[PDB]
Symmetry: D2
Subunit: 389 residues, 4 copies
């Protein structure tokens, strides 16, 4: 019944890098237009735009709506943002699928968008500060990466999972290197080109077109990896090297009923067979994908063994290993072209980013069943099952 | 099919007033536990919490999850925030309804929360400011009350509707006084008591229980109304007295299938018969409710005249008069107990606030069909049809 | 040789009190004007204006010049600010005296001004913060009241004195209360009237004339003093009651040679017979007055017993008791009209403020020899000897 | 009677350049140490440190003391900051001269220090900002470079000077370029090494020794100067190229009586024969050096023509030309090694920076009579006459 007609994602920028001064809606705009062009659908036919975005402080009213208009979706359509933190990008797509499923909409553009670079610093200053210093809060750290119940960073949650699952430094380092190597491989081979829609960084002293994931590191060594210091736990195991990064980017999908696609001559990227969201302990939020993935499979009537390709987000090597280890899926069909440790992790957009990767890889290799999953801070998981047509 | 088993809202506080230093998720928690208590449903049976909230900057990771956990909803359920500006609160109820409708969940707590008071000032400072003054941005104004396309305040959008619908100052002023008198009348007769759930302002030098809408003004006079100066257009017609206020508040509804309600012996506040969202020109966003309410009515199979009760959000006097003028519904059955001009307008929570009033009024006067509707910044409208059982 | 022809000070404002939004140069202007007027001297005859001021951040270019110009001092004259912390106001007069002494000026206006209320919060943001919160530093605290070598407040230096000299809480409290009672008595008898020049707080909704020290507490009780908690050392002895306050004000003196005063028919407030500044350990900065007073007396050819009156600044009860104890001067001739615990402490202005108090009470009671001294953060003292004519 | 026994200055840093994050007191300490070393004078014999500094906000209590204590001056000695804007650095040495003159000290360290780069942004937030955006004020611009009466930059006073003296853009640029080329040639020949004491910028990933004036431009061309846009008056004449820069540095002199230097066997850098400070119209502040230099020369009993070397600060090419045109001194003996357009303008230090320059060059060519003068914001000038021994 509901299918992904087309899809597109911008390249992933490094922190304060290529998209350093680009507002997330800009990145979104471009992705909205791309999904539209790639399927032959006119913006005028878009009913609603849903965009997962975790840090929009200071971008103005509802960046989802700004993105949609910038791209040309008429003012008669609707737009909104939503936040399930890292699962935002993937959840948006589910939510959009429900819009068509309940007959409230026909065509939806959904995904995520995020400019971690552009997240501001803030302070509550309405009462006034009579005396003494006050903190100017980094909304990126406070609103997107800090557990609100234990007050510590996601990296600490990762450390909790490492200890629990007895995942050594070498084993988390091994996983990261492989991720880099696979992402680099995929980049060289043209593997990211279909899914990437080039973005034009509007300059003054010149325009710059970005069309390659700039965070991927070429020739990542195990030696450099092993020399890094732990980033969260002073005598910890998680490092800048075996953890995803801070990044900017956008990604989305054009959804419509399978029938509609058919009436249009569109060859869909896949059929949304099922999706699931489940909570877990915030302290070990990285385990999220276990229950969520299993729930999704259950709802789809699929067995883990049925999957031909998987995209399980790499928030941290320790959590990625734990997930794989627990689920037991064949490592070889998970993050085939690299994961977030190499590609980057634009919070609100990452679920749609990985959906794009999964979808273009399933088409290129001819896989039939796929699943995308992500862990969520605060202790949640989100998963989606896709079947090719 | 999907029914609102129960509902609850906090009192709406004034700006920097009773809830001045209360983070939205604390009010959210209170309301979520009320709805459970009220229906006789255990926190453990909640699948997900959906909370619209337009201004979470500074509150920490996903305040929706923080509300849920604080209220006792286990770590197993899931939670998420969403933004459709002033339509957030109502929209969230519709999205939860769809969670159930598609069989993804059984029981959802939905609504919105907002702390305008706690909205911080911010500035993007990662790049640094090498020389020169820079502006500290009020995020409530920028991210909540400023049109992103024309750069002006919602108040100006109100002025655009005023001029277009030829709504004089005296006519808006009249409308405002009536809403105050009607909000004061209803407060005096205990008409807001079922819906309100007292909120304990945790103090140090005393704990204060808030259970009354503090923003309503007792004895509002037309003379005082007519002496106020225009707040947005220097030679304008919109003023502080005929515009909604800056407020805090949280409201929610407990949703489940009609059959489930029946299995539990619950007496539902009503069945969600339909809902809709439609866009309009951002310049005259106040018109939002016209196209959305009609759509909602159309999807429900109802005529405007079928409606027994109506709650149409009082963003601004200008817009409310325009809405009523166009739709033509009998004025006496619209905002019977007063509106946002008197009660307050906690952006992200207002759509669920007005559903509460609609729902407890419908039960108290035995009205069968009702409709809630709100105008949304950026040019959008949201509407919902509820029928009692 | 060099005399003080006239002097004047504004009443001392409470923190965020009467002068909450008055820039220090405005208060300085009025005192410049008063001193001129009081001496029969025209602003066109001033050669230079010298004003200590420790916290001028945000006031604009050299506020000493802004004060001079506001007062009508001709653009041909010159102005400069200086900072020797709490000894600033007194040091200026010394430096003004030396302008005359060396023949480079004939007529100087010298004193101090300080708006502790208008001191701003700041941050160095040229480089940008790539991530993480940063502090907004209270400049009042940082640049005015925090020792730069040990990182702690001036109050902690008070605690180090308390301990070392074995001054109990009780003794400190007794000192504070006698300060209050004496200042209150002098206020009520009209003792502060000759020295205060009334300041007009330019309002919108009315102008307010301030001509009374508002910080002096009427009816101060020992019981209320003794229940206060330690302000700097959780199990300390220094409290808000026994410490000076945070205050606003300005004060100055018009200087010229004795022979010039005589050609003008002026009866001068006194002859500057000597002055001195000496350092001590920063940890016990409050002991500054000891060596500076002893040095001034020696330069004057005076024994301690020759003094008729003394003004020794009350930075803190603890340090004031220590200075009196060590010096051994008759306590009844010290701060006879109350001191800074009661009157307040506008840092840059206080040395000139207590020099006004000394001058006008030496005239009133016919005291022939007087000395004014103040303790300075960072470990310094300043003292000056005055002889009537 | 009072001689400059030795002197020293750091190299001048570019804005956010080599000393981007070096607090001024650190650079002052190194200059304190250097004067001491250069004269065979131990830090224990210093009585007082006087350092001009215009922008100390956020550096902590009295940076002159912090510099003195870092250099090892005993805690028994004293220190203070003063501010007469751009003539601060020179005013201080006149001020130190006066201490010895009047017998209050025997050995003084005086000069100035500034780090424009470390100046912060601020806001007065004590009263609170109920709502709306507020300004974060660059203290360098506001407190250092804007006229307090006319509200415009020091550069617009430059434009005023340009029109009034009819100084074309061409004349300005050619003085600018000749400044650059003489500083480049004295840099290259080694004429700045005697005056400069190397500064070690404490690294983490390496200590950096800074011993060269980095703002100096090598190969400055008339053509690229001529292509620059006006910086203050959109259709003006003052550009970035013919105006001084924004810089960092410190500079000082060690003073004592001529008799004292003879008892120690010190061959002094000169005798301070006179100084003068005079005001002028704030709108043409750049003309300050005119009356100040004539005044100093008359107190010295010298004719303009007796001077052998002159250092006249380059605030802007337009005022520099005006000052040279009126005084009429031979241009060939003015700033023979370049000036501030090329070397840099750390406001509080500049006066002392150009005295060093003066001093060293009078020594090297055997000049007997020299003068150092500087224009001061707010309408003022300072100048000093030096005679070799
Ligand atoms: C891990 C984290 C704290 C690192 O932040 P940081 O310290 O500012 O990161 P950096 O990139 O500066 O790391 C420091 C260095 O490690 C180096 N580094 C990173 N990966 C490397 C690799 N694979 N090999 C070699 N060096 C590497 C960087 O190049 C850098 O070198 P430098 O110090 O010379 O600049 C941050 O990326 C983070 O919080 N990430 C995401 C975590 C998260 O919770 N995401 C949400 C998911 S739940
Ligand atoms: C209208 C608005 C700009 C007013 O802001 P403000 O100037 O800070 O408001 P205030 O409450 O201070 O109004 C000033 C005065 O009006 C007075 N006032 C308000 N309503 C009044 C009435 N009915 N009768 C008499 N006086 C009244 C207040 O009491 C106050 O008196 P004071 O000056 O002695 O304090 C603000 O309410 C606003 O933007 N509101 C919401 C509009 C909006 O866009 N909502 C989103 C919906 S799309
Ligand atoms: C001591 C100090 C830290 C107090 O700051 P604060 O805590 O914000 O001060 P407050 O005025 O709020 O004092 C707190 C309370 O004590 C009370 N209080 C003060 N003196 C009192 C007295 N004599 N009797 C009774 N109550 C008294 C105040 O009235 C107030 O009551 P409240 O809590 O109901 O408002 C501040 O004054 C300070 O730093 N002072 C001296 C500064 C200094 O170092 N200056 C340079 C000297 S080198
Ligand atoms: C004049 C002023 C505003 C320039 O500030 P800015 O615009 O940020 O300065 P910059 O140095 O970035 O701009 C100069 C631009 O022209 C270039 N430029 C400067 N001098 C040049 C020269 N001599 N030849 C060629 N190009 C030159 C700079 O490289 C820069 O080029 P870029 O932007 O491509 O990198 C600032 O330096 C100033 O305010 N100086 C004032 C000093 C003052 O008032 N002091 C107290 C005086 S009383």
């Amino acid at each position: 019944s509901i299918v992904i007609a087309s899809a597109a994602r911008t390249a992933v920028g490094s922190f304060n890098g290529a998209f350093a001064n680009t507002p997330a809606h800009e990145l979104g705009a471009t992705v909205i237009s791309a999904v539209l062009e790639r399927a032959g659908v006119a913006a005028g036919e878009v009913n609603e735009v849903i965009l997962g975005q975790v840090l929009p402080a200071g971008e103005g009213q509802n960046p989802a709506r700004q993105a949609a208009m910038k791209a040309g979706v008429p003012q008669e359509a609707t737009a909104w943002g939503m936040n399930q933190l890292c699962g935002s990008g993937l959840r948006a797509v589910a939510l959009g699928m429900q819009q068509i499923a309940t007959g409230d909409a026909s065509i939806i553009v959904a995904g995520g968008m995020e400019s971690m670079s552009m997240a501001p610093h803030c302070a509550h200053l309405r009462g006034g500060v009579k005396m003494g210093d006050f903190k100017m809060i980094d909304t990126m750290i406070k609103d997107g990466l800090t557990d609100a119940f234990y007050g510590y960073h996601m990296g600490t949650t990762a450390e909790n999972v490492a200890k629990q699952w007895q995942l050594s430094r070498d084993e988390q380092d091994a996983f990261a290197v492989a991720s880099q190597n696979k992402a680099e491989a995929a980049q060289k081979d043209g593997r990211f080109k279909d899914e990437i829609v080039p973005f034009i960084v509007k300059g003054r002293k010149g325009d710059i077109t970005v069309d390659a994931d700039e965070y991927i590191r070429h020739g990542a060594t195990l030696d450099s990896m092993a020399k890094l210091r732990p980033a969260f736990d002073k005598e910890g195991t998680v490092t800048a090297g075996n953890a995803s990064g801070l990044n900017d980017g956008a990604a989305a999908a054009l959804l419509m009923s399978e029938a509609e696609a058919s009436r249009r001559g569109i060859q869909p990227l896949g059929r949304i067979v099922s999706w699931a969201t489940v909570g877990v302990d915030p302290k070990v939020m990285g385990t999220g994908p276990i229950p969520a993935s299993r729930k999704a499979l259950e709802r789809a009537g699929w067995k883990i063994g049925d999957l031909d390709l998987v995209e399980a987000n790499e928030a941290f090597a320790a959590q990625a290993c734990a997930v794989n280890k627990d689920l037991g899926w064949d490592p070889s069909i998970v993050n085939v072209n690299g994961g977030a440790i190499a590609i980057g992790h634009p919070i609100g957009a990452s679920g749609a980013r990985i959906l794009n990767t999964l979808l273009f890889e399933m088409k290129r290799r001819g896989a039939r069943k796929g699943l995308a999953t992500l862990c969520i801070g605060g202790g949640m998981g989100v998963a989606m099952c896709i079947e090719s047509l």
